[PDB]
Each structure stands twice: as structure tokens, then as C-alpha cells.
């Protein structure tokens, strides 16, 4: 009958202290299409290098994670892994 597609989220951390949501969003589109992006921050409105971003599909995120693993950002090394 009717079925709802299953979404997936990527675990990204280790981003620079100068990295913002706009910068990260730009990166996601490079590997695919950023459909959902959220930046972990407190009520103070302080952005943080730890956040999650869901991909339109599973294949896109899968091919993106392999190529994005070890990606150098501002001379820094970030870690990316798939969730469930």
C-alpha cells in the first residue's frame, strides 16, 4: 500500500572553531544535496563543531562518507561516520 522512506543521518565532528553552518552546508552540497542541516548550539546561540546532516538518499551519503573520510578543513582533520 503506502510506505514512508527511511531517512539517514551522518555523524560529523572535529570541525574548526571558525566553521559555521553556512560553511558546512556548502560542503554537504559538494558531495550531494543537503536536504536537512542542523547545528548543535545552546540557548546562548553558540555554534559548535558537532552536528548531524541527513542526506536525500542512502547511496548519496554512503559515497559521500567514504570520500569525505579524512577530509581536511582549515588544515584540520574531521571524522565522519554513518548512523545505523
JSON list of N, CA and C in Angstrom, two decimals:
[
{"chain": "A", "resi": 1, "resn": "UNK", "atom": "N", "xyz": [0.83, -1.24, 0.00]},
{"chain": "A", "resi": 1, "resn": "UNK", "atom": "CA", "xyz": [0.00, 0.00, 0.00]},
{"chain": "A", "resi": 1, "resn": "UNK", "atom": "C", "xyz": [0.84, 1.26, 0.00]},
{"chain": "A", "resi": 2, "resn": "UNK", "atom": "N", "xyz": [0.99, 1.87, 1.17]},
{"chain": "A", "resi": 2, "resn": "UNK", "atom": "CA", "xyz": [1.77, 3.09, 1.31]},
{"chain": "A", "resi": 2, "resn": "UNK", "atom": "C", "xyz": [2.90, 2.90, 2.31]},
{"chain": "A", "resi": 3, "resn": "UNK", "atom": "N", "xyz": [4.11, 3.30, 1.92]},
{"chain": "A", "resi": 3, "resn": "UNK", "atom": "CA", "xyz": [5.28, 3.17, 2.79]},
{"chain": "A", "resi": 3, "resn": "UNK", "atom": "C", "xyz": [6.07, 4.47, 2.82]},
{"chain": "A", "resi": 4, "resn": "UNK", "atom": "N", "xyz": [6.64, 4.79, 3.98]},
{"chain": "A", "resi": 4, "resn": "UNK", "atom": "CA", "xyz": [7.42, 6.01, 4.15]},
{"chain": "A", "resi": 4, "resn": "UNK", "atom": "C", "xyz": [8.91, 5.72, 4.07]},
{"chain": "A", "resi": 5, "resn": "UNK", "atom": "N", "xyz": [9.61, 6.42, 3.19]},
{"chain": "A", "resi": 5, "resn": "UNK", "atom": "CA", "xyz": [11.04, 6.25, 3.02]},
{"chain": "A", "resi": 5, "resn": "UNK", "atom": "C", "xyz": [11.78, 6.47, 4.34]},
{"chain": "A", "resi": 6, "resn": "UNK", "atom": "N", "xyz": [12.85, 5.71, 4.54]},
{"chain": "A", "resi": 6, "resn": "UNK", "atom": "CA", "xyz": [13.64, 5.81, 5.76]},
{"chain": "A", "resi": 6, "resn": "UNK", "atom": "C", "xyz": [14.79, 6.80, 5.58]},
{"chain": "A", "resi": 7, "resn": "UNK", "atom": "N", "xyz": [14.88, 7.76, 6.49]},
{"chain": "A", "resi": 7, "resn": "UNK", "atom": "CA", "xyz": [15.93, 8.77, 6.43]},
{"chain": "A", "resi": 7, "resn": "UNK", "atom": "C", "xyz": [17.18, 8.31, 7.17]},
{"chain": "A", "resi": 8, "resn": "UNK", "atom": "N", "xyz": [18.31, 8.93, 6.84]},
{"chain": "A", "resi": 8, "resn": "UNK", "atom": "CA", "xyz": [19.58, 8.59, 7.47]},
{"chain": "A", "resi": 8, "resn": "UNK", "atom": "C", "xyz": [20.32, 9.84, 7.90]},
{"chain": "A", "resi": 9, "resn": "UNK", "atom": "N", "xyz": [21.12, 9.72, 8.95]},
{"chain": "A", "resi": 9, "resn": "UNK", "atom": "CA", "xyz": [21.88, 10.86, 9.46]},
{"chain": "A", "resi": 9, "resn": "UNK", "atom": "C", "xyz": [23.36, 10.53, 9.56]},
{"chain": "A", "resi": 10, "resn": "UNK", "atom": "N", "xyz": [24.19, 11.51, 9.27]},
{"chain": "A", "resi": 10, "resn": "UNK", "atom": "CA", "xyz": [25.63, 11.34, 9.34]},
{"chain": "A", "resi": 10, "resn": "UNK", "atom": "C", "xyz": [26.18, 12.01, 10.59]},
{"chain": "A", "resi": 11, "resn": "UNK", "atom": "N", "xyz": [27.22, 11.43, 11.16]},
{"chain": "A", "resi": 11, "resn": "UNK", "atom": "CA", "xyz": [27.81, 11.99, 12.36]},
{"chain": "A", "resi": 11, "resn": "UNK", "atom": "C", "xyz": [29.11, 12.70, 12.01]},
{"chain": "A", "resi": 12, "resn": "UNK", "atom": "N", "xyz": [29.07, 14.02, 12.03]},
{"chain": "A", "resi": 12, "resn": "UNK", "atom": "CA", "xyz": [30.24, 14.83, 11.72]},
{"chain": "A", "resi": 12, "resn": "UNK", "atom": "C", "xyz": [30.69, 15.65, 12.92]},
{"chain": "A", "resi": 13, "resn": "UNK", "atom": "N", "xyz": [32.00, 15.63, 13.17]},
{"chain": "A", "resi": 13, "resn": "UNK", "atom": "CA", "xyz": [32.59, 16.36, 14.28]},
{"chain": "A", "resi": 13, "resn": "UNK", "atom": "C", "xyz": [34.05, 16.69, 13.99]},
{"chain": "A", "resi": 14, "resn": "UNK", "atom": "N", "xyz": [34.67, 17.45, 14.90]},
{"chain": "A", "resi": 14, "resn": "UNK", "atom": "CA", "xyz": [36.06, 17.82, 14.71]},
{"chain": "A", "resi": 14, "resn": "UNK", "atom": "C", "xyz": [36.25, 19.02, 13.79]},
{"chain": "A", "resi": 15, "resn": "UNK", "atom": "N", "xyz": [35.16, 19.73, 13.52]},
{"chain": "A", "resi": 15, "resn": "UNK", "atom": "CA", "xyz": [35.22, 20.90, 12.65]},
{"chain": "A", "resi": 15, "resn": "UNK", "atom": "C", "xyz": [35.98, 22.05, 13.32]},
{"chain": "A", "resi": 16, "resn": "UNK", "atom": "N", "xyz": [36.57, 22.95, 12.52]},
{"chain": "A", "resi": 16, "resn": "UNK", "atom": "CA", "xyz": [37.32, 24.10, 13.04]},
{"chain": "A", "resi": 16, "resn": "UNK", "atom": "C", "xyz": [36.47, 25.01, 13.92]},
{"chain": "A", "resi": 17, "resn": "UNK", "atom": "N", "xyz": [37.14, 25.90, 14.64]},
{"chain": "A", "resi": 17, "resn": "UNK", "atom": "CA", "xyz": [36.46, 26.84, 15.53]},
{"chain": "A", "resi": 17, "resn": "UNK", "atom": "C", "xyz": [35.91, 28.03, 14.73]},
{"chain": "A", "resi": 18, "resn": "UNK", "atom": "N", "xyz": [36.32, 28.13, 13.47]},
{"chain": "A", "resi": 18, "resn": "UNK", "atom": "CA", "xyz": [35.87, 29.21, 12.59]},
{"chain": "A", "resi": 18, "resn": "UNK", "atom": "C", "xyz": [34.80, 28.72, 11.61]},
{"chain": "A", "resi": 19, "resn": "UNK", "atom": "N", "xyz": [34.46, 27.43, 11.68]},
{"chain": "A", "resi": 19, "resn": "UNK", "atom": "CA", "xyz": [33.46, 26.85, 10.80]},
{"chain": "A", "resi": 19, "resn": "UNK", "atom": "C", "xyz": [32.04, 27.15, 11.28]},
{"chain": "A", "resi": 20, "resn": "UNK", "atom": "N", "xyz": [31.19, 27.58, 10.35]},
{"chain": "A", "resi": 20, "resn": "UNK", "atom": "CA", "xyz": [29.80, 27.90, 10.66]},
{"chain": "A", "resi": 20, "resn": "UNK", "atom": "C", "xyz": [28.85, 27.04, 9.85]},
{"chain": "A", "resi": 21, "resn": "UNK", "atom": "N", "xyz": [27.56, 27.18, 10.12]},
{"chain": "A", "resi": 21, "resn": "UNK", "atom": "CA", "xyz": [26.56, 26.40, 9.41]},
{"chain": "A", "resi": 21, "resn": "UNK", "atom": "C", "xyz": [26.62, 26.65, 7.91]},
{"chain": "A", "resi": 22, "resn": "UNK", "atom": "N", "xyz": [26.81, 27.90, 7.51]},
{"chain": "A", "resi": 22, "resn": "UNK", "atom": "CA", "xyz": [26.88, 28.22, 6.09]},
{"chain": "A", "resi": 22, "resn": "UNK", "atom": "C", "xyz": [28.04, 27.49, 5.43]},
{"chain": "A", "resi": 23, "resn": "UNK", "atom": "N", "xyz": [29.18, 27.42, 6.12]},
{"chain": "A", "resi": 23, "resn": "UNK", "atom": "CA", "xyz": [30.35, 26.75, 5.59]},
{"chain": "A", "resi": 23, "resn": "UNK", "atom": "C", "xyz": [30.11, 25.24, 5.45]},
{"chain": "A", "resi": 24, "resn": "UNK", "atom": "N", "xyz": [29.53, 24.64, 6.48]},
{"chain": "A", "resi": 24, "resn": "UNK", "atom": "CA", "xyz": [29.25, 23.20, 6.47]},
{"chain": "A", "resi": 24, "resn": "UNK", "atom": "C", "xyz": [28.23, 22.84, 5.39]},
{"chain": "A", "resi": 25, "resn": "UNK", "atom": "N", "xyz": [27.19, 23.66, 5.29]},
{"chain": "A", "resi": 25, "resn": "UNK", "atom": "CA", "xyz": [26.14, 23.44, 4.30]},
{"chain": "A", "resi": 25, "resn": "UNK", "atom": "C", "xyz": [26.73, 23.39, 2.90]},
{"chain": "A", "resi": 26, "resn": "UNK", "atom": "N", "xyz": [27.70, 24.27, 2.66]},
{"chain": "A", "resi": 26, "resn": "UNK", "atom": "CA", "xyz": [28.37, 24.33, 1.37]},
{"chain": "A", "resi": 26, "resn": "UNK", "atom": "C", "xyz": [29.08, 23.02, 1.08]},
{"chain": "A", "resi": 27, "resn": "UNK", "atom": "N", "xyz": [29.68, 22.44, 2.12]},
{"chain": "A", "resi": 27, "resn": "UNK", "atom": "CA", "xyz": [30.40, 21.18, 1.99]},
{"chain": "A", "resi": 27, "resn": "UNK", "atom": "C", "xyz": [29.47, 20.02, 1.64]},
{"chain": "A", "resi": 28, "resn": "UNK", "atom": "N", "xyz": [28.31, 19.95, 2.30]},
{"chain": "A", "resi": 28, "resn": "UNK", "atom": "CA", "xyz": [27.35, 18.88, 2.05]},
{"chain": "A", "resi": 28, "resn": "UNK", "atom": "C", "xyz": [26.91, 18.83, 0.60]},
{"chain": "A", "resi": 29, "resn": "UNK", "atom": "N", "xyz": [26.61, 19.99, 0.02]},
{"chain": "A", "resi": 29, "resn": "UNK", "atom": "CA", "xyz": [26.17, 20.03, -1.36]},
{"chain": "A", "resi": 29, "resn": "UNK", "atom": "C", "xyz": [27.27, 19.55, -2.32]},
{"chain": "A", "resi": 30, "resn": "UNK", "atom": "N", "xyz": [28.53, 19.72, -1.92]},
{"chain": "A", "resi": 30, "resn": "UNK", "atom": "CA", "xyz": [29.66, 19.29, -2.76]},
{"chain": "A", "resi": 30, "resn": "UNK", "atom": "C", "xyz": [29.63, 17.79, -3.01]},
{"chain": "A", "resi": 31, "resn": "UNK", "atom": "N", "xyz": [29.27, 17.04, -1.99]},
{"chain": "A", "resi": 31, "resn": "UNK", "atom": "CA", "xyz": [29.21, 15.59, -2.08]},
{"chain": "A", "resi": 31, "resn": "UNK", "atom": "C", "xyz": [27.82, 15.10, -2.51]},
{"chain": "A", "resi": 32, "resn": "UNK", "atom": "N", "xyz": [26.82, 15.94, -2.32]},
{"chain": "A", "resi": 32, "resn": "UNK", "atom": "CA", "xyz": [25.46, 15.59, -2.69]},
{"chain": "A", "resi": 32, "resn": "UNK", "atom": "C", "xyz": [24.53, 16.78, -2.57]},
{"chain": "A", "resi": 33, "resn": "UNK", "atom": "N", "xyz": [23.33, 16.54, -2.07]},
{"chain": "A", "resi": 33, "resn": "UNK", "atom": "CA", "xyz": [22.37, 17.62, -1.89]},
{"chain": "A", "resi": 33, "resn": "UNK", "atom": "C", "xyz": [21.94, 17.70, -0.43]},
{"chain": "A", "resi": 34, "resn": "UNK", "atom": "N", "xyz": [22.25, 18.81, 0.22]},
{"chain": "A", "resi": 34, "resn": "UNK", "atom": "CA", "xyz": [21.89, 19.00, 1.62]},
{"chain": "A", "resi": 34, "resn": "UNK", "atom": "C", "xyz": [20.40, 19.27, 1.75]},
{"chain": "A", "resi": 35, "resn": "UNK", "atom": "N", "xyz": [19.68, 18.32, 2.32]},
{"chain": "A", "resi": 35, "resn": "UNK", "atom": "CA", "xyz": [18.24, 18.45, 2.50]},
{"chain": "A", "resi": 35, "resn": "UNK", "atom": "C", "xyz": [17.90, 18.93, 3.91]},
{"chain": "A", "resi": 36, "resn": "UNK", "atom": "N", "xyz": [18.64, 18.43, 4.89]},
{"chain": "A", "resi": 36, "resn": "UNK", "atom": "CA", "xyz": [18.42, 18.80, 6.28]},
{"chain": "A", "resi": 36, "resn": "UNK", "atom": "C", "xyz": [19.75, 19.04, 6.97]},
{"chain": "A", "resi": 37, "resn": "UNK", "atom": "N", "xyz": [19.89, 20.19, 7.61]},
{"chain": "A", "resi": 37, "resn": "UNK", "atom": "CA", "xyz": [21.12, 20.53, 8.30]},
{"chain": "A", "resi": 37, "resn": "UNK", "atom": "C", "xyz": [20.84, 21.27, 9.59]},
{"chain": "A", "resi": 38, "resn": "UNK", "atom": "N", "xyz": [21.38, 20.76, 10.69]},
{"chain": "A", "resi": 38, "resn": "UNK", "atom": "CA", "xyz": [21.18, 21.39, 11.99]},
{"chain": "A", "resi": 38, "resn": "UNK", "atom": "C", "xyz": [22.51, 21.54, 12.72]},
{"chain": "A", "resi": 39, "resn": "UNK", "atom": "N", "xyz": [22.71, 22.70, 13.33]},
{"chain": "A", "resi": 39, "resn": "UNK", "atom": "CA", "xyz": [23.95, 22.97, 14.06]},
{"chain": "A", "resi": 39, "resn": "UNK", "atom": "C", "xyz": [23.69, 22.98, 15.56]},
{"chain": "A", "resi": 40, "resn": "UNK", "atom": "N", "xyz": [24.33, 22.06, 16.27]},
{"chain": "A", "resi": 40, "resn": "UNK", "atom": "CA", "xyz": [24.18, 21.95, 17.71]},
{"chain": "A", "resi": 40, "resn": "UNK", "atom": "C", "xyz": [24.67, 23.20, 18.43]},
{"chain": "A", "resi": 41, "resn": "UNK", "atom": "N", "xyz": [23.75, 23.85, 19.12]},
{"chain": "A", "resi": 41, "resn": "UNK", "atom": "CA", "xyz": [24.05, 25.06, 19.87]},
{"chain": "A", "resi": 41, "resn": "UNK", "atom": "C", "xyz": [23.10, 25.25, 21.04]},
{"chain": "A", "resi": 42, "resn": "UNK", "atom": "N", "xyz": [23.58, 25.90, 22.09]},
{"chain": "A", "resi": 42, "resn": "UNK", "atom": "CA", "xyz": [22.77, 26.15, 23.28]},
{"chain": "A", "resi": 42, "resn": "UNK", "atom": "C", "xyz": [21.88, 27.37, 23.08]},
{"chain": "A", "resi": 43, "resn": "UNK", "atom": "N", "xyz": [21.11, 27.71, 24.12]},
{"chain": "A", "resi": 43, "resn": "UNK", "atom": "CA", "xyz": [20.21, 28.85, 24.05]},
{"chain": "A", "resi": 43, "resn": "UNK", "atom": "C", "xyz": [21.01, 30.14, 23.80]},
{"chain": "A", "resi": 44, "resn": "UNK", "atom": "N", "xyz": [22.27, 30.13, 24.21]},
{"chain": "A", "resi": 44, "resn": "UNK", "atom": "CA", "xyz": [23.15, 31.28, 24.04]},
{"chain": "A", "resi": 44, "resn": "UNK", "atom": "C", "xyz": [23.40, 31.57, 22.56]},
{"chain": "A", "resi": 45, "resn": "UNK", "atom": "N", "xyz": [23.13, 30.59, 21.70]},
{"chain": "A", "resi": 45, "resn": "UNK", "atom": "CA", "xyz": [23.35, 30.78, 20.28]},
{"chain": "A", "resi": 45, "resn": "UNK", "atom": "C", "xyz": [24.79, 30.56, 19.88]},
{"chain": "A", "resi": 46, "resn": "UNK", "atom": "N", "xyz": [25.49, 29.72, 20.65]},
{"chain": "A", "resi": 46, "resn": "UNK", "atom": "CA", "xyz": [26.89, 29.42, 20.38]},
{"chain": "A", "resi": 46, "resn": "UNK", "atom": "C", "xyz": [27.01, 28.19, 19.47]},
{"chain": "A", "resi": 47, "resn": "UNK", "atom": "N", "xyz": [27.50, 28.35, 18.22]},
{"chain": "A", "resi": 47, "resn": "UNK", "atom": "CA", "xyz": [27.64, 27.22, 17.29]},
{"chain": "A", "resi": 47, "resn": "UNK", "atom": "C", "xyz": [28.73, 26.26, 17.73]},
{"chain": "A", "resi": 48, "resn": "UNK", "atom": "N", "xyz": [28.63, 25.00, 17.31]},
{"chain": "A", "resi": 48, "resn": "UNK", "atom": "CA", "xyz": [29.62, 24.01, 17.69]},
{"chain": "A", "resi": 48, "resn": "UNK", "atom": "C", "xyz": [29.98, 23.07, 16.54]},
{"chain": "A", "resi": 49, "resn": "UNK", "atom": "N", "xyz": [31.24, 22.65, 16.53]},
{"chain": "A", "resi": 49, "resn": "UNK", "atom": "CA", "xyz": [31.76, 21.75, 15.51]},
{"chain": "A", "resi": 49, "resn": "UNK", "atom": "C", "xyz": [31.09, 20.37, 15.46]},
{"chain": "A", "resi": 50, "resn": "UNK", "atom": "N", "xyz": [30.16, 20.12, 16.36]},
{"chain": "A", "resi": 50, "resn": "UNK", "atom": "CA", "xyz": [29.46, 18.84, 16.39]},
{"chain": "A", "resi": 50, "resn": "UNK", "atom": "C", "xyz": [28.04, 19.04, 15.89]},
{"chain": "A", "resi": 51, "resn": "UNK", "atom": "N", "xyz": [27.66, 18.28, 14.87]},
{"chain": "A", "resi": 51, "resn": "UNK", "atom": "CA", "xyz": [26.32, 18.39, 14.30]},
{"chain": "A", "resi": 51, "resn": "UNK", "atom": "C", "xyz": [26.01, 17.21, 13.38]},
{"chain": "A", "resi": 52, "resn": "UNK", "atom": "N", "xyz": [24.75, 17.07, 13.00]},
{"chain": "A", "resi": 52, "resn": "UNK", "atom": "CA", "xyz": [24.33, 15.98, 12.12]},
{"chain": "A", "resi": 52, "resn": "UNK", "atom": "C", "xyz": [23.60, 16.51, 10.87]},
{"chain": "A", "resi": 53, "resn": "UNK", "atom": "N", "xyz": [23.78, 15.81, 9.75]},
{"chain": "A", "resi": 53, "resn": "UNK", "atom": "CA", "xyz": [23.14, 16.21, 8.49]},
{"chain": "A", "resi": 53, "resn": "UNK", "atom": "C", "xyz": [22.62, 15.00, 7.71]},
{"chain": "A", "resi": 54, "resn": "UNK", "atom": "N", "xyz": [21.31, 14.97, 7.48]},
{"chain": "A", "resi": 54, "resn": "UNK", "atom": "CA", "xyz": [20.66, 13.88, 6.74]},
{"chain": "A", "resi": 54, "resn": "UNK", "atom": "C", "xyz": [20.74, 14.10, 5.23]},
{"chain": "A", "resi": 55, "resn": "UNK", "atom": "N", "xyz": [20.93, 13.01, 4.50]},
{"chain": "A", "resi": 55, "resn": "UNK", "atom": "CA", "xyz": [21.03, 13.06, 3.04]},
{"chain": "A", "resi": 55, "resn": "UNK", "atom": "C", "xyz": [19.74, 12.60, 2.36]},
{"chain": "A", "resi": 56, "resn": "UNK", "atom": "N", "xyz": [19.48, 13.17, 1.20]},
{"chain": "A", "resi": 56, "resn": "UNK", "atom": "CA", "xyz": [18.29, 12.84, 0.42]},
{"chain": "A", "resi": 56, "resn": "UNK", "atom": "C", "xyz": [18.14, 11.33, 0.26]},
{"chain": "A", "resi": 57, "resn": "UNK", "atom": "N", "xyz": [19.24, 10.62, 0.04]},
{"chain": "A", "resi": 57, "resn": "UNK", "atom": "CA", "xyz": [19.17, 9.17, -0.12]},
{"chain": "A", "resi": 57, "resn": "UNK", "atom": "C", "xyz": [20.26, 8.48, 0.70]},
{"chain": "A", "resi": 58, "resn": "UNK", "atom": "N", "xyz": [20.30, 7.15, 0.62]},
{"chain": "A", "resi": 58, "resn": "UNK", "atom": "CA", "xyz": [21.28, 6.36, 1.36]},
{"chain": "A", "resi": 58, "resn": "UNK", "atom": "C", "xyz": [22.59, 6.25, 0.57]},
{"chain": "A", "resi": 59, "resn": "UNK", "atom": "N", "xyz": [22.46, 6.05, -0.73]},
{"chain": "A", "resi": 59, "resn": "UNK", "atom": "CA", "xyz": [23.61, 5.91, -1.61]},
{"chain": "A", "resi": 59, "resn": "UNK", "atom": "C", "xyz": [24.46, 7.18, -1.62]},
{"chain": "A", "resi": 60, "resn": "UNK", "atom": "N", "xyz": [23.79, 8.33, -1.67]},
{"chain": "A", "resi": 60, "resn": "UNK", "atom": "CA", "xyz": [24.50, 9.60, -1.69]},
{"chain": "A", "resi": 60, "resn": "UNK", "atom": "C", "xyz": [25.36, 9.75, -0.45]},
{"chain": "A", "resi": 61, "resn": "UNK", "atom": "N", "xyz": [24.78, 9.50, 0.71]},
{"chain": "A", "resi": 61, "resn": "UNK", "atom": "CA", "xyz": [25.52, 9.60, 1.97]},
{"chain": "A", "resi": 61, "resn": "UNK", "atom": "C", "xyz": [26.65, 8.58, 2.03]},
{"chain": "A", "resi": 62, "resn": "UNK", "atom": "N", "xyz": [26.41, 7.38, 1.51]},
{"chain": "A", "resi": 62, "resn": "UNK", "atom": "CA", "xyz": [27.41, 6.32, 1.52]},
{"chain": "A", "resi": 62, "resn": "UNK", "atom": "C", "xyz": [28.63, 6.66, 0.67]},
{"chain": "A", "resi": 63, "resn": "UNK", "atom": "N", "xyz": [28.40, 7.19, -0.52]},
{"chain": "A", "resi": 63, "resn": "UNK", "atom": "CA", "xyz": [29.51, 7.55, -1.39]},
{"chain": "A", "resi": 63, "resn": "UNK", "atom": "C", "xyz": [30.21, 8.79, -0.86]},
{"chain": "A", "resi": 64, "resn": "UNK", "atom": "N", "xyz": [29.43, 9.65, -0.20]},
{"chain": "A", "resi": 64, "resn": "UNK", "atom": "CA", "xyz": [29.95, 10.88, 0.37]},
{"chain": "A", "resi": 64, "resn": "UNK", "atom": "C", "xyz": [30.84, 10.64, 1.58]},
{"chain": "A", "resi": 65, "resn": "UNK", "atom": "N", "xyz": [30.43, 9.71, 2.45]},
{"chain": "A", "resi": 65, "resn": "UNK", "atom": "CA", "xyz": [31.21, 9.40, 3.65]},
{"chain": "A", "resi": 65, "resn": "UNK", "atom": "C", "xyz": [32.60, 8.86, 3.35]},
{"chain": "A", "resi": 66, "resn": "UNK", "atom": "N", "xyz": [32.70, 7.96, 2.37]},
{"chain": "A", "resi": 66, "resn": "UNK", "atom": "CA", "xyz": [34.00, 7.38, 2.01]},
{"chain": "A", "resi": 66, "resn": "UNK", "atom": "C", "xyz": [34.96, 8.45, 1.50]},
{"chain": "A", "resi": 67, "resn": "UNK", "atom": "N", "xyz": [34.47, 9.31, 0.62]},
{"chain": "A", "resi": 67, "resn": "UNK", "atom": "CA", "xyz": [35.28, 10.38, 0.05]},
{"chain": "A", "resi": 67, "resn": "UNK", "atom": "C", "xyz": [35.50, 11.52, 1.05]},
{"chain": "A", "resi": 68, "resn": "UNK", "atom": "N", "xyz": [34.59, 11.67, 2.00]},
{"chain": "A", "resi": 68, "resn": "UNK", "atom": "CA", "xyz": [34.70, 12.72, 3.00]},
{"chain": "A", "resi": 68, "resn": "UNK", "atom": "C", "xyz": [35.49, 12.28, 4.23]},
{"chain": "A", "resi": 69, "resn": "UNK", "atom": "N", "xyz": [35.77, 10.99, 4.34]},
{"chain": "A", "resi": 69, "resn": "UNK", "atom": "CA", "xyz": [36.52, 10.47, 5.48]},
{"chain": "A", "resi": 69, "resn": "UNK", "atom": "C", "xyz": [37.97, 10.95, 5.43]},
{"chain": "A", "resi": 70, "resn": "UNK", "atom": "N", "xyz": [38.34, 11.77, 6.41]},
{"chain": "A", "resi": 70, "resn": "UNK", "atom": "CA", "xyz": [39.69, 12.29, 6.48]},
{"chain": "A", "resi": 70, "resn": "UNK", "atom": "C", "xyz": [39.84, 13.62, 5.76]},
{"chain": "A", "resi": 71, "resn": "UNK", "atom": "N", "xyz": [38.72, 14.20, 5.34]},
{"chain": "A", "resi": 71, "resn": "UNK", "atom": "CA", "xyz": [38.74, 15.48, 4.64]},
{"chain": "A", "resi": 71, "resn": "UNK", "atom": "C", "xyz": [39.37, 16.56, 5.50]},
{"chain": "A", "resi": 72, "resn": "UNK", "atom": "N", "xyz": [40.29, 17.31, 4.89]},
{"chain": "A", "resi": 72, "resn": "UNK", "atom": "CA", "xyz": [40.98, 18.38, 5.59]},
{"chain": "A", "resi": 72, "resn": "UNK", "atom": "C", "xyz": [40.25, 19.70, 5.47]},
{"chain": "A", "resi": 73, "resn": "UNK", "atom": "N", "xyz": [39.89, 20.26, 6.61]},
{"chain": "A", "resi": 73, "resn": "UNK", "atom": "CA", "xyz": [39.20, 21.53, 6.65]},
{"chain": "A", "resi": 73, "resn": "UNK", "atom": "C", "xyz": [40.01, 22.51, 7.49]},
{"chain": "A", "resi": 74, "resn": "UNK", "atom": "N", "xyz": [40.50, 23.55, 6.85]},
{"chain": "A", "resi": 74, "resn": "UNK", "atom": "CA", "xyz": [41.30, 24.55, 7.55]},
{"chain": "A", "resi": 74, "resn": "UNK", "atom": "C", "xyz": [42.49, 23.87, 8.23]},
{"chain": "A", "resi": 75, "resn": "UNK", "atom": "N", "xyz": [43.10, 22.94, 7.50]},
{"chain": "A", "resi": 75, "resn": "UNK", "atom": "CA", "xyz": [44.25, 22.18, 7.99]},
{"chain": "A", "resi": 75, "resn": "UNK", "atom": "C", "xyz": [43.88, 21.26, 9.15]},
{"chain": "A", "resi": 76, "resn": "UNK", "atom": "N", "xyz": [42.58, 21.09, 9.41]},
{"chain": "A", "resi": 76, "resn": "UNK", "atom": "CA", "xyz": [42.13, 20.22, 10.49]},
{"chain": "A", "resi": 76, "resn": "UNK", "atom": "C", "xyz": [41.54, 18.93, 9.94]},
{"chain": "A", "resi": 77, "resn": "UNK", "atom": "N", "xyz": [41.54, 17.88, 10.77]},
{"chain": "A", "resi": 77, "resn": "UNK", "atom": "CA", "xyz": [41.00, 16.59, 10.35]},
{"chain": "A", "resi": 77, "resn": "UNK", "atom": "C", "xyz": [39.66, 16.31, 11.02]},
{"chain": "A", "resi": 78, "resn": "UNK", "atom": "N", "xyz": [38.67, 16.00, 10.20]},
{"chain": "A", "resi": 78, "resn": "UNK", "atom": "CA", "xyz": [37.33, 15.71, 10.69]},
{"chain": "A", "resi": 78, "resn": "UNK", "atom": "C", "xyz": [36.97, 14.24, 10.56]},
{"chain": "A", "resi": 79, "resn": "UNK", "atom": "N", "xyz": [36.06, 13.78, 11.41]},
{"chain": "A", "resi": 79, "resn": "UNK", "atom": "CA", "xyz": [35.63, 12.39, 11.40]},
{"chain": "A", "resi": 79, "resn": "UNK", "atom": "C", "xyz": [34.17, 12.30, 10.97]},
{"chain": "A", "resi": 80, "resn": "UNK", "atom": "N", "xyz": [33.90, 11.41, 10.02]},
{"chain": "A", "resi": 80, "resn": "UNK", "atom": "CA", "xyz": [32.54, 11.22, 9.52]},
{"chain": "A", "resi": 80, "resn": "UNK", "atom": "C", "xyz": [32.17, 9.74, 9.50]},
{"chain": "A", "resi": 81, "resn": "UNK", "atom": "N", "xyz": [31.02, 9.41, 10.10]},
{"chain": "A", "resi": 81, "resn": "UNK", "atom": "CA", "xyz": [30.56, 8.03, 10.14]},
{"chain": "A", "resi": 81, "resn": "UNK", "atom": "C", "xyz": [29.04, 7.95, 9.98]},
{"chain": "A", "resi": 82, "resn": "UNK", "atom": "N", "xyz": [28.57, 6.85, 9.40]},
{"chain": "A", "resi": 82, "resn": "UNK", "atom": "CA", "xyz": [27.15, 6.65, 9.19]},
{"chain": "A", "resi": 82, "resn": "UNK", "atom": "C", "xyz": [26.45, 6.18, 10.46]},
{"chain": "A", "resi": 83, "resn": "UNK", "atom": "N", "xyz": [25.20, 6.60, 10.60]},
{"chain": "A", "resi": 83, "resn": "UNK", "atom": "CA", "xyz": [24.40, 6.24, 11.77]},
{"chain": "A", "resi": 83, "resn": "UNK", "atom": "C", "xyz": [23.43, 5.11, 11.44]},
{"chain": "A", "resi": 84, "resn": "UNK", "atom": "N", "xyz": [23.52, 4.01, 12.18]},
{"chain": "A", "resi": 84, "resn": "UNK", "atom": "CA", "xyz": [22.65, 2.86, 11.96]},
{"chain": "A", "resi": 84, "resn": "UNK", "atom": "C", "xyz": [22.63, 2.46, 10.49]}
]
